[PDB]
Amino acid sequence: PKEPEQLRKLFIGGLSFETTDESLRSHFEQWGTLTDCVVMRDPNTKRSRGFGFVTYATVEEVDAAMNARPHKVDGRVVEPKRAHLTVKKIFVGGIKEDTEEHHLRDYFEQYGKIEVIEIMTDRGSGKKRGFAFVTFDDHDSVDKIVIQKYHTVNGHNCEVRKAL
Numbered sequence: 001p002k003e004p005e006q007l008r009k010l011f012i013g014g015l016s017f018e019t020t021d022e023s024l025r026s027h028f029e030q031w032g033t034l035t036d037c038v039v040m041r042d043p044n045t046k047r048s049r050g051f052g053f054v055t056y057a058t059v060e061e062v063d064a065a066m067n068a069r070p071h072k073v074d075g076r077v078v079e080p081k082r083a084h085l086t087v088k089k090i091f092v093g094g095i096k097e098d099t100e101e102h103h104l105r106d107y108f109e110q111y112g113k114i115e116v117i118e119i120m121t122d123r124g125s126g127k128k129r130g131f132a133f134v135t136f137d138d139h140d141s142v143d144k145i146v147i148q149k150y151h152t153v154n155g156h157n158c159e160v161r162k163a164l
């Protein structure tokens with residue numbers, strides 16, 4: 001049963017205008033089977049629009065490609081993104097008053113490198129408010145997190161969203 005195609009796509013920005021379907025494919029095939037690979041071009045001039053997309057056979061292959069950044073394709077460092085509000089911070093709700101830093105860290109560190117964990121407390125009483133913010137060193141962590149249907153931390157079913 002294949003993962004939805006949308007979750008297997010990488011948008012690739014910042015291409016060299018000399019990158020082609022073939023050279024984009026030869027590069028990104030290093031990290032998995034590509035079912036699709038397209039450079040976007042002007043319909044009249046055929047001049048590159050400077051971005052394209054690749055579709056892998058599996059989500060684990062998307063992960064491998066993102067873990068191999070930075071990608072230099074035909075001499076230029078490109079910008080791959082999954083299926084954009086590009087942020088490095090998430091809101092984590094529903095953690096109640098018994099969730100601590102290490103609960104959040106042990107779970108979220110497997111999505112990416114954590115730089116900040118902020119467990120929110122009441123300005124007047126100091127009591128925990130039941131939500132937190134986690135800041136990562138890179139946006140792909142957040143992108144992986146927010147497409148999951150479920151997040152379970154410290155036994156709690158959590159609501160997780162991009163934080164701006």
Ligand SMILES: CCn1cc(C(=O)NCc2ccc(F)cc2)cn1
Binds near residue numbers: 011083
């Ligand atoms: C950057 C992450 N991301 C990109 C999309 C996307 O659909 N790309 C926009 C686009 C596609 C083709 C065009 F011709 C013009 C614009 C979705 N998420």
